[PDB]
Design a protein around this ligand. Structure first.
Ligand SMILES: [Mn+2]
Ligand SMILES: [Mn+2]
Ligand SMILES: [Mn+2]
Ligand SMILES: [Mn+2]
Lengths: 198, 198, 198, 198
């Protein structure tokens, strides 16, 4: 059964880029609800699967994807942020960003654009395409998780649900995006990247 | 283990409205493939469940919905047809059709139009809305099954995938729809309805 | 050229059910953005259509549906609210609700459930089904408008995008739904209903 | 005014790989219906635009995408096939295929997989990603066209609607895909590729 992970930092640690109330609500209410609903749905799915009830299995798919994807996504998201984050990555990850997007700044432009571009709720991602052996940017709607729906391995996610920024930035999602670069934990993104090449 | 159901009649029994070559391919290849693939997918989902691998669970959803849906939908379809079919229903179902659609012929027009209106692959349905306590027509894409995706109880389904008609009617789906009324098993449709008036 | 309609009341007219900060942001920022983007998208569509550029037309569809949809839906929503609203509708609209949903209370529970049920961004609707001549509840994702995507005529819509409630109710969307019943403009819903007896 | 392009060859020129009955129906019935529905839908769209009728614009989108996409996709497809085709491309296009997919044979495996993988109606594509400056494989549902929905420039498309193969290969879509390699017009695919780097 799934459990809600502790953040790697206190709720106010990402101030002033992401305020404390957002972090507290986002973690203790939104991600919490994902975990609790996922446990409930998984238990129902097992019963349906055991009885061979295919209609029930299919009726449970939206809740499984939404809550299961929210747990996957939020869990990665917390680790992708740090009070000591910002700047640029180094080494092989920086080399690949240059290779695949031209420059770190071009890369930032493209993830920002993919994130700003989500109409409704969703996520922007930097992922790794294992088949092509290179980085790839992708957007996902609602809580659809990157690897389970696209096969890309997630490296850095940007939540652009309104609850991720509205209390502080209101409708101005581009101000949130500008601010979040200040808290990206490139050490974590680097670790995820290197794990794709072993 | 799911199994391919036996048909209630021979492959040639619906001639000349649905030819024998279509019935044999439809049942022994298309539905058979949905059953075989569904069994594999359910096995993989049990393993994913046992591991708490939510990514694997979500990645299996399209195959489960497609092949599970195709098993649900084709199994109902076979029972909805008969060499001894055709004509109009009677009793309570007929009275329900007049109550909700005006007349049997108006109903036929509306289910025809929903079936003709599917762009790409899919199904037209006459269903029962338990909340509203009345009949309802709906169309579904690909193999998305009626009850698992809409909550409606399926009473009569019309497969409008090209494999359901193309060998005989080619591009002219309305000719197929006109023909299929001659083989509807209204006795089955009535049993499904009464089991809704449970 | 589409324009932002004035609200029928001041920004704090719906206190304390929907606060003045939400009303001012919702109207002057969110709906304003829909209007501007719709005007720009329409002009680009016109250009594409004159050149017979089908690719360009299809690339513009997401922006047109989203911003066109947002303009349609927000414009209806302001007219569906009033400082002099709430309670139960008077006249034939209440008789139709009782007929189709059993009672006002059950109707409230069902539209609340459809609105709570939206996963991600979207709208709950009370619509009119002209073909069947009765009321119908439907949910729509993002800004997809009811009539253009389902054919139902909108009577009453509930915006359940997070910007519609988050600053005041945070994650507790059901508290928002409980509150909005106090400001429904049944005179407007009735006008819309009477215009469907057509 | 859009028009139905003549095929570049006779209906029987792709025998035995794609038979004459399929080519004749596919062009004279399927593509032909797309062209007239496109023209009619474009004229309705002009009227809706002139009136500022946003609901009408949104309600016409499914017909515009389906039939405009069908026109785009089928027009490319006829040019992608040749009685003098088959084999492998040469020059820059082959070098890009090796760079991006490993080898021509791995490319064929990957476009076959994408095309086999479509559940329901749709298309497999080799495209060009202009932002990344490299090749990319993608699948599209129904008649959704590649460039208009994904941004990728189409180079080679494989129709896997059942009407593209069923009369000849019945349910065995993999046997159609094996066969079609024998009639790919690599001269045309090369022309399309080189135009991407102008
Ligand atoms: Mn979130
Ligand atoms: Mn079928
Ligand atoms: Mn809104
Ligand atoms: Mn085709």
């Amino acid at each position: 059964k799934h459990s809600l992970p502790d953040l790697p930092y206190d709720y106010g640690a990402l101030e002033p880029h992401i305020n404390a109330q957002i972090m507290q609500l986002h973690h203790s209410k939104h991600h919490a609800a994902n975990v609790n609903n996922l446990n409930v749905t998984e238990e129902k799915y097992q019963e349906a699967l055991a009885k061979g009830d295919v209609t029930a299995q299919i009726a449970l798919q939206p809740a499984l994807k939404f809550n299961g994807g929210g747990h996957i996504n939020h869990s990665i998201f917390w680790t992708n942020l740090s009070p000591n984050g910002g700047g640029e990555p180094k080494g092989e990850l920086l080399e690949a960003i240059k290779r695949d997007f031209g420059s770190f700044d071009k890369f930032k432009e493209k993830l920002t654009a993919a994130s700003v571009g989500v109409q409704g709720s969703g996520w922007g991602w930097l992922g790794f395409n294992k088949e092509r052996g290179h980085l790839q940017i992708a957007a996902c709607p609602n809580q659809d998780p990157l690897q389970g729906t696209t096969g890309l391995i997630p490296l850095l996610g940007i939540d652009v649900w309104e609850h991720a920024y509205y209390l502080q930035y209101k409708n101005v999602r581009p101000d949130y995006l500008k601010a979040i670069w200040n808290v990206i934990n490139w050490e974590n993104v680097t670790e995820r990247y290197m794990a794709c090449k072993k």
